[PDB]
Design a binder for these strands. Structure first.
Ligand SMILES: [Mg+2]
Ligand SMILES: [Mg+2]
Ligand SMILES: [Mg+2]
Ligand SMILES: [Zn+2]
Lengths: 65, 238, 148, 134, 50, 121, 181, 73
RNA sequence: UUGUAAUUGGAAUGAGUACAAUGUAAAUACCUUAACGAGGAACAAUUGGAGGGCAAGUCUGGUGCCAGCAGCCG
């Protein structure tokens, strides 16, 4: 299974958005592509997929997150 | 190795009262004061002499710190036939009974021990051997048993105590004869485990010099035992 | 009976694995001048040299030499009696310090020898695993003590 | 009184005296005047180019003798003729007449050794890792 | 290949003229990484002869 | 003075019983007075554990007689039901023995507890 | 242009590399701790020398000096945390009594050996470099990794490691496949 | 096609024969250390676990006239 | 109980190759990762220094059978 935890959440109504750091636990998997992360975040925060952006994803040494 | 039915050749060792049994392996042996029995289960060698059947006991260096010493080749051993010896730390007859063998009927062994339970067997062993006088008493206060002991030619201390130097000096001050024998067994771990062994031995030698014992010899006891040296000295009163 | 002295258990070929901090160091009589003469304090020139706590040791023989020196070397005498300097008793008749020092290091491989005498230094050099301390230039120097 | 002024306001005489006397050192004089490279074998360079004039020991009977390893070289910078060592006779084969040889500091009196011939390391040739371009 | 070096050795012994290495068929490579490594190895080897 | 001596405290008993459970899992534990006697005869016991509430206490006093003869550390715990629990056996245990093994995977804590037991003695 | 990024050398050549006693000392250290080369020993020695020189300088300062108190306390805390300095020896004097061996034992290689995960120090090195060892939840492949007291109890076989419950490595499954075929 | 061979490609030239241990310094130092320990066992008596089972005597024999202890002068 | 193996067993693994994803303005690379990737593990570590020994071989000198030089050449 894959779990997505959002941390350091900030609400920026100046830019009309929410910023956060996404940590993705993906045991037994290489990594999660930005598409699946986008659809899961869209489901979690109940928004349209086009309204979700994700970037800057780095897997630590040793894998798993 | 040394099996039950094996035949061996017994020959004297350089030190009087110590004999060597030869063969494919060599065994350093002492004549049995009380023949026909083993005290801690040691192997016994019987020889027919015109014919009387004299017996001998094997003398395990891994059990008696003294024995590993002679295996290492101590130059001088004051323990000799017909001499008075004062054994400190006589936990049992494992080593005392053998020291009794060397001194022979003419000498005696003053065995000193503190803890009651090991002392009981020391009393039991003393029964078979007339020449031991076990003294169940704390060596730290030689005043208590000054009644039981006269002069002694050599003082042996196997006591494993951090203040072992003090005990030797007090005992030596009382009963050791002038120019007498001093043989000490030292374990640095018991004295000072913080510092290395060699530092400890130098410190112990120093305290002996403070107490008018002139050190004569010391030897490390490997491969039989770790961190152990036997210091041999002479008590120089004047 | 033949004697073959047993090489000390503190020695692996030429490295002494027993000498470790805090170090115990024997003080030679000549060391005191070249300490005083160079304005180098005894305790701490050692610490600066060895970067450790050092326990100086003055034997009776080296001590016995010092009072024999006389008034000219009173300063050396007083520094020898600094209470931080511990004293070692001796049980051999001779008062020759160089022989006494050589014997002690022969006996137990736990001392550093602090001296500048060429003859004594050579004798100690022959004995394996004896760190040899000396004072030269401005401060103390240690040759056979790789933990440095 | 040690023969030097010692007042609290006398550094100038000390400074001026020090500057005047500091020229006595040969090392200081060479460093400031830029004459330290006169004594250099190559006149200030670490390596010198040269021209092989003749292989003096090529006729020697004893193999791998010291004479066999000496080559006469003309220093191209000044035209002065000098002698140089080659590591071995096997290396002497590579060296032939009228080639570039790079010389470096080293039979007393010979103070140079060949390190490159025709722009290629002699060692590289001797290990057989390059071919001398002619 | 042999023919390249045989010419190089012949040139070396009879007097080196100017030599310019030109590498071809590099488009046949599929990955950029392996292309660069081959370029590095080829260049260094080529540097030895010329 | 009491026959059961030395007796480990609440803190000390836990680490001892901790080693006991780990030893049981690795087949390095000998359970019961009879087994402990055999190990002491063979000289394969690292140290011996006894319960101070053995009913009566005397039936295990032969281990102390054996122990210091062989120079083996020993110590008493207040409870046998607790000792049997950690042993992994469905019955109370009045005594157990840790078998000597310098290749064991739980060597380090065995020596740690042994050092404390030696200090207590 | 962009501001410089600082750099430093983590080791220094000794005053006299050619002492026979010294050479034997590095022979001991490498052999017992399975060090690849002498540079590792020199690095540890340089770090230790820096530490002890700082300790000496702090000692020279008078007692109760705020700089002395602060900086000595920080140094003792760090040394205790890495584990070279035992809890009962929290004084600057014992810092001067430290030795290279203390730091060497704290290396992940030696700790892996002592914990019984490896049968030799070299076996520990090959296990670490092959990504089989994890401190806590993270995989460490660096033998020079220094273990903290808290981290010591968390050393284990990595989840991804075949020894740690993952699938068999390539050799094992290759052999199984050929055997089945 | 005539591809270049290994001698051509690496151009190692003439080099001395070198032992495999040099390829990994770690193995070389391991072997050196173990050889040193074996030499020490000859230089000196070193403890080797102590007594293992029944005491079977000394295997190498006793020398009555040899003393290995160090003398005070 | 020491040294030596083109002896031998099955376990681990990355250099490299490569689906994919991540990374990036777009790419390469890193961290990940399906699948391949080891016995001469030829998947062929180097740079210097020191010391030998060998011939129906070669040169030089001489209080005989020797000595020096040296020995890719018999
Ligand atoms: Mg005047
Ligand atoms: Mg690359
Ligand atoms: Mg993996
Ligand atoms: Zn003296």
């Amino acid at each position: 299974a894959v779990t997505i935890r959002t941390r350091k959440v900030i609400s920026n109504p100046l830019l009309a958005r929410k910023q956060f750091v996404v940590d993705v636990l993906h045991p037994n998997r290489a990594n999660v592509s930005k598409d699946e992360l986008r659809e899961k975040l869209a489901e979690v925060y109940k928004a349209e997929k086009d309204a979700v952006s994700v970037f800057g994803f780095r897997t630590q040494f040793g894998g798993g997150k | 190795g040394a099996r039950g039915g094996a035949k061996v050749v017994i020959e004297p060792h350089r030190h009087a009262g110590v004999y060597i049994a030869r063969g494919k392996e060599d065994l350093l042996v002492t004549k049995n004061m009380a023949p026909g029995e083993s005290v801690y289960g040691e192997k016994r060698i019987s020889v027919e002499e015109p014919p009387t059947k004299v017996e001998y006991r094997v003398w395990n260096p891994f059990r008696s710190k003294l024995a590993a010493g002679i295996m290492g080749g101590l130059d001088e051993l004051f323990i000799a036939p017909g001499k008075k010896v004062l054994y400190l730390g006589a936990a049992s007859g494992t080593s005392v009974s053998h020291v009794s063998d060397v001194v022979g009927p003419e000498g005696v062994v003053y065995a000193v021990e503190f803890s009651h339970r090991p002392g009981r067997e020391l009393i039991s062993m003393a029964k078979k051997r007339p020449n031991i006088i076990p003294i169940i008493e704390d060596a730290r206060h030689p005043q208590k048993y000054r009644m039981l002991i006269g002069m002694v030619d050599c003082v042996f201390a196997d006591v494993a105590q951090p203040d072992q130097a003090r005990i030797i000096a007090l005992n030596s001050h009382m009963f050791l004869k002038d120019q007498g024998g001093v043989v000490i067994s030292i374990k640095a771990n018991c004295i000072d485990s913080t510092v290395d062994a060699e530092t400890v031995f130098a410190r112990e030698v120093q305290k002996l010099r403070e107490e008018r014992i002139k050190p004569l010899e010391q030897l490390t006891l490997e491969p039989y035992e770790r961190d152990h040296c036997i210091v041999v000295g002479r008590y120089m009163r004047s | 009976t033949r004697n073959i002295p047993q090489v000390s258990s503190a020695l692996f070929f030429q490295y002494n694995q027993a000498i470790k901090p805090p170090y115990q160091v024997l003080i030679d009589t000549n060391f005191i001048n070249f300490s005083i003469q160079k304005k180098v304090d005894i305790v701490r020139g050692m610490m600066d040299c060895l970067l450790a706590k050092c326990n100086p040791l003055i034997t009776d023989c080296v001590m016995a030499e010092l009072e024999k020196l006389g008034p000219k070397y009173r300063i050396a005498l007083k520094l020898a009696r600094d209470p931080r300097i511990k004293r070692l008793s001796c049980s051999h008749k001779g008062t020759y310090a160089d022989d006494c020092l050589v014997h002690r290091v022969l006996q137990h491989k736990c001392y550093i020898v602090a001296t500048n005498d060429a003859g004594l230094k050579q004798r100690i050099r022959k004995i394996p695993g004896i760190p040899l301390m000396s004072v030269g230039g401005h401060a103390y120097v240690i040759e056979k003590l790789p933990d440095v | 009184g040690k023969g030097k002024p010692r007042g609290l306001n006398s550094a100038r005489k000390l400074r001026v005296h020090r500057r005047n006397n500091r020229w006595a050192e040969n090392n200081y004089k060479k460093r400031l005047l830029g004459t330290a490279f006169k004594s250099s074998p190559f006149g200030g360079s670490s390596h010198a180019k040269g021209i092989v004039l003749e292989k003096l020991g090529i006729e020697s009977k004893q193999p791998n003798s010291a004479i066999r390893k000496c080559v006469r070289v003309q220093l191209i910078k000044n035209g002065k003729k000098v002698t140089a060592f080659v590591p071995n006779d096997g290396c002497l084969n590579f060296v032939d007449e009228n080639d570039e040889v790079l010389l470096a500091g080293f039979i007393p009196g010979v103070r140079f050794k060949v390190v490159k011939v025709s722009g290629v390391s002699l060692l590289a040739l001797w290990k057989e890792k390059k071919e001398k371009p002619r | 290949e042999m023919e390249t070096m045989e010419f190089l050795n012949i040139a070396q012994h009879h007097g080196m003229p100017r030599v310019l290495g030109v590498a071809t068929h590099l488009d046949l490579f599929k990955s950029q990484s392996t292309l660069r490594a081959s370029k590095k190895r080829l260049k260094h080897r080529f540097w030895t002869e010329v | 003075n009491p026959k059961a001596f030395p007796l480990a405290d609440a803190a000390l008993t836990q680490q001892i019983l901790d080693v006991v459970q780990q030893a049981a899992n690795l087949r390095q534990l000998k359970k019961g007075a009879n087994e402990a006697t055999k190990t002491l005869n063979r000289g394969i016991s690292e140290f011996i554990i006894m319960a101070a509430d053995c009913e009566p206490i005397e039936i295990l006093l032969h281990l102390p007689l054996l122990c210091e003869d062989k120079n083996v550390p020993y110590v008493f715990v207040p409870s046998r039901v607790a000792l049997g629990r950690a042993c992994g056996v469905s019955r109370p245990v009045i005594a157990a023995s840790i078998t000597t093994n310098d290749a064991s995977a739980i060597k380090t804590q065995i020596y740690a507890v042994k050092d404390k037991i030696e200090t207590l003695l | 242009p962009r501001a410089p990024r600082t750099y430093s050398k983590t080791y220094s050549t000794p005053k006299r590399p050619y002492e026979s006693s010294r050479l034997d000392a590095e022979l001991k250290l490498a052999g017992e701790f399975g060090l690849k080369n002498k540079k590792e020993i020199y690095r540890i020695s340089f770090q230790l020398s820096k530490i002890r020189r700082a300790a000496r300088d702090l000692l020279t300062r008078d007692e109760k000096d705020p700089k002395r108190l602060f900086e000595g306390n920080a140094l003792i805390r760090r040394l205790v945390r890495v584990g070279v300095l035992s809890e009962d020896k929290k004084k600057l004097d014992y810092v001067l009594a430290l030795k290279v061996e203390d730091f060497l034992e704290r290396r992940l290689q030696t700790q892996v050996y002592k914990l019984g995960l490896a049968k030799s120090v070299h076996h520990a090195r090959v296990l670490i470099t092959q990504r089989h060892i994890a401190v806590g939840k993270q995989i460490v492949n660096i033998p020079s990794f220094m273990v903290r007291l808290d981290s010591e109890k968390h050393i284990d076989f990595a989840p991804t490691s075949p020894f740690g419950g993952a699938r068999p490595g390539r050799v094992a499954r290759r052999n199984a496949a050929r055997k089945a075929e | 096609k005539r591809a270049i061979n290994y001698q051509i490609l690496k151009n190692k030239g003439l080099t001395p024969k070198r032992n495999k241990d040099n390829r990994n310094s770690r193995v070389k130092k391991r072997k050196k250390y173990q050889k040193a320990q074996k030499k020490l066992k000859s230089v000196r008596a070193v403890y080797s676990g102590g007594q293992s089972g029944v005491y079977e005597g000394e295997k190498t024999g006793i020398k009555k006239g040899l003393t290995r202890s160090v003398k005070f002068k």
